[PDB]
């Protein structure tokens, strides 16, 4: 049954208990942004990482 | 690590049923019959007890940092 409207979904949906794993890759570890931050000595270009 | 309070899918309290489940398993009851005796009806709640691994007992073997 559709959660928002309550109407039965016309196509019957495949449901069951499946085992799922949470991989170590998480968005908080990957989000990054740069704006005139630290700069390397030799190249005098923005740093890496 | 320890039996979750409340089934994830619906929210029925399953935290109070682990010790009773283990006792019923010791009695003779099959896993399904014990789950029925505890009142777990939907397969979402039965997954909570059936698939639970109680690691808190293994962690309690290590001695506490402060005694």
């Amino acid at each position: 049954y559709n959660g928002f409207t309550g109407r039965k979904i016309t196509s019957q949906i495949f449901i069951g208990p499946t085992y799922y794993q949470r991989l170590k890759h998480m968005v908080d570890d990957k989000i990054h942004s740069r704006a005139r931050g630290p700069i390397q000595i030799l190249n005098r270009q923005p740093m890496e990482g | 690590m320890i039996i979750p309070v409340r089934c994830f899918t619906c929210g029925k309290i399953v935290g109070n049923k682990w010790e009773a489940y283990l006792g019923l398993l010791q009695a003779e009851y099959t896993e399904g019959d014990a789950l029925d005796a505890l009142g777990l009806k939907r397969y979402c709640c039965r997954r909570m007890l059936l698939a639970h691994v109680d690691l808190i007992e293994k962690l309690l073997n290590y001695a506490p940092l402060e005694k």
Binding site: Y1, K8, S11, Q12 | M1, I2, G11, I13, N16, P64
Partner: protein, 257 residues
């Protein structure tokens, strides 16, 4: 041009369950009543935890999580209690919250099962649905858990800890006569418990003029609120949301004029 008059028939009433049928109502109204059951019925649950000492294996925020999920009796005073935002006093006070305390130490050799029974409330009306018990943590000898908690009014839209219900079963058209679900092979499909069809007939004949009515509900209580009062509070809360909407609408219409 006006609202239909709904009718209710309660089939089952037990301390944990209410099975009822609402007839002559719209699908939207019925679904939103179910939605309010799940998300917009106020309840009392722990939302502030301060752990003085936690030497248990579980970390502090794990303990706080488990304490928040513990149901608390909220039958009468949840309507009296105010939200923390509404209360004039800074932080929390008897009117906006309830205080619990836990002081457990495993002095004995045998493992001590800290349960919801060990939580002690300052007001007798809120108790952790103890009258087994929910296991907060297991303590080895020499391990101690001491904490103070404050429980506040809230509803399930904020957090699932405030859900007053376990599973709301909602069904309409038990025998498919509006063809809202089109079975590829109707015979393979199990009959509903509310189905009135004979065993030979898999589906009722298509009703071209039909509209979803006679909705069947089974509301299971989590123990915090009685299953009857979950439904009554949901109806009242939906009515209050509509009335607030109407007040704001009238004010803005007056402003436009």
């Amino acid at each position: 041009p006006y609202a239909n008059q709904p009718t209710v028939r309660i089939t089952e009433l037990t301390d944990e369950n209410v099975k009822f049928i609402i007839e002559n109502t719209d699908l939207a109204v019925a679904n939103s009543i179910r939605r309010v059951f799940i998300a917009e019925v106020p309840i009392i649950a722990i939302d502030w935890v301060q752990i003085d000492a936690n030497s248990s294996v579980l970390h502090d925020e794990f303990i706080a999580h488990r304490l928040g999920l513990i149901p608390l009796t909220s039958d009468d005073i949840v309507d009296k209690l105010q939200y923390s935002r509404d209360c004039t006093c800074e932080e929390f006070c008897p009117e906006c919250s309830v205080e619990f305390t836990l002081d457990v130490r495993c002095n004995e050799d045998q493992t001590r099962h800290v349960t919801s029974r060990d939580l002690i409330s300052n007001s007798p009306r809120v108790i952790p649905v103890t009258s087994d018990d929910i296991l907060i943590v297991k303590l080895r000898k020499g391990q101690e858990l001491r904490l103070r908690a404050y429980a506040k009014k809230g509803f399930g839209k904020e957090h699932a800890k405030w859900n007053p219900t376990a599973g709301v079963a909602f069904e309409y058209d038990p025998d498919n006569a509006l063809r809202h679900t089109v079975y590829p092979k109707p015979e393979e499909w199990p009959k509903s418990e509310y189905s009135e069809l004979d065993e030979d007939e898999s589906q009722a004949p298509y009703d071209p003029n039909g509209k979803p009515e006679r909705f069947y509900y089974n509301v299971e209580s989590c123990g915090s609120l009685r299953p009857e009062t979950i439904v009554l509070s949901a109806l009242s809360g939906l009515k209050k949301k509509l009335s607030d909407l109407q007040t704001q609408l009238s004010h803005e219409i007056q402003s436009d004029v």
